């Protein structure tokens, strides 16, 4: 009922801000395709640009989540900054193709493991790919990926929140909504919901190493990080 509506709003929010792999015209590039290097500049340029576009979509997504824009502006910002890498990493891993060991970005750009490494992932590469491989067999749909993204974002344990209890309260209906949706879709598998939740814990771990990678990449890249990336991650 009221749970049904919350699910539908979150499904729509995600679907409308996230093109699926099947919808995209995959294309490749020859850029350092086979040799691991510390950084490929042309790949970094494409990757950072796509990242900027994805952050914009993530904000659009957040604004469609019930109650999000009712939080203080300071808390909306704090939540978005804290969840930024978690959501980006979830999104790119959602477009993993095992056969060629590739991930596909929102414009269709399809990079292999070596190119992902070369683009900026560096020491993060194998962990991110491990995550993608463990995500895939869960067979999540838009509602489930959308809900997990929302649960990751609307988290009351983030440092520097003005109203953490209020954030906790807003998260409660999302956890309930996912629990009831997952058991509807997969009645035979009651172990699915907690296995879904531990992806968040995995994501948190990866994004912590991600913040370390932001540091080391800044030393490697030619100029400065793009302004929006700076706002989110600095």
């Amino acid at each position: 009922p009221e749970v049904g509506e919350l699910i539908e709003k979150v499904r729509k929010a995600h679907q409308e801000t996230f093109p699926a792999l099947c919808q995209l015209g995959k294309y490749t590039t020859n850029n350092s395709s086979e040799q691991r290097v510390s950084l490929d500049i042309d790949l970094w340029d494409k990757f950072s640009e796509l990242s900027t576009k994805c952050i914009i979509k993530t904000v659009e997504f957040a604004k469609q989540l019930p109650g999000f824009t009712t939080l203080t502006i300071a808390d909306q910002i704090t939540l978005l900054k804290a969840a930024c890498l978690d959501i980006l990493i979830l999104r790119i891993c959602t477009r993993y193709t095992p056969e060629q060991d590739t991930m596909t970005f929102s414009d269709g750009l399809t990079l292999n493991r070596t190119q992902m490494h070369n683009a900026g992932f560096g020491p993060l590469t194998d962990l991110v790919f491990a995550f993608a491989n463990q995500l895939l067999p869960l067979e999540m749909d838009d509602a489930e990926t959308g809900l997990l993204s929302a649960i990751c974002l609307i988290c009351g344990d983030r440092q520097d929140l003005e109203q953490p209890d209020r954030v906790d309260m807003l998260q409660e209906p999302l956890l309930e909504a996912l629990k009831v949706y997952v058991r509807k879709r997969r009645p035979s598998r009651p172990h699915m919901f907690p296995k879904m939740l531990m992806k968040i814990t995995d994501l948190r771990s990866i994004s912590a190493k991600g913040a370390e990678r932001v540091i080391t990449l800044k030393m490697e890249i030619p100029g400065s990080m793009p302004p929006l990336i700076q706002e989110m991650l600095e």
Binding site: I56, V59, E60, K63, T69, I73, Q76, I77, L80, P227, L228, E231, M232
Partner: peptide, 10 residues
């Protein structure tokens, strides 16, 4: 957070 503020309004 100039850009983020702008995006949050729109």
């Amino acid at each position: 957070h100039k850009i983020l503020h702008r995006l949050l309004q729109e």
